[PDB]
Amino acid sequence: TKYNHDTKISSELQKKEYKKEDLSKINSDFKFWLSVENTNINYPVVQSKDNSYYLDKDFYKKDSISGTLFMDYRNKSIDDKNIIIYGHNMKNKTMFNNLNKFKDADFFKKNNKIKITLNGKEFLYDVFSAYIVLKTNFNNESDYQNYINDITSKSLYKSPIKVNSNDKIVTLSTCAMVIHGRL
Letter for the amino acid at 127? V
Per-residue CA distances from 43 to 70, 109, 115, 117, 140 (Å): 10, 24, 11, 11, 32
Q: Which of 118, 132, 134, 175 is catalytic?
A: 175
Residues 6+ apart with CB under 8 A from 104: none
Which residue in 31, 81, 88, 101 is the catalytic one?
88
175 is a catalytic site residue: yes
Q: How far is CA 104 from CA 11, 92, 124, 125, in A?
A: 26, 19, 21, 19
Active site residues: 88, 175
